[PDB]
């Protein structure tokens, strides 16, 4: 019924870090179209005093993934990580940018 508040399209990596650092909550995130790899997508998340970047990988079947679990759409990848840690290093759960 309403558009997703996490799609920022084509913004530079540095721009995403800029906006996210201003966020008050860990897990604040946005999906941006990648700069190192055009056509691809990147996930930027605020965590502590930093902004971490995750590359959205793709396979031959068009599925999206960050680690091992594969998703059929960015939408599902995003929702899954609202309850499950987006990272295997630290426990980080996606929260909408405010």
């Amino acid at each position: 019924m309403k558009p997703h508040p996490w799609f920022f399209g084509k913004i530079p990596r540095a721009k995403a870090e800029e906006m996210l650092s201003k966020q008050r909550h860990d897990g604040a995130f946005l999906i941006r179209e990648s700069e190192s790899a055009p056509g691809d997508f990147s996930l930027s998340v605020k965590f502590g005093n930093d902004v971490q970047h995750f590359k959205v990988l793709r396979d031959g079947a068009g599925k999206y993934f960050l680690w091992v679990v594969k998703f059929n759409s960015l939408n599902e990848l995003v929702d899954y990580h609202r309850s499950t840690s987006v990272s295997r290093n630290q426990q980080i759960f996606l929260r909408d940018i405010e």
Partner: peptide, 6 residues
């Protein structure tokens, strides 16, 4: 470089 792909 990314968290999931150093």
């Amino acid at each position: 470089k990314y968290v999931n792909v150093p």
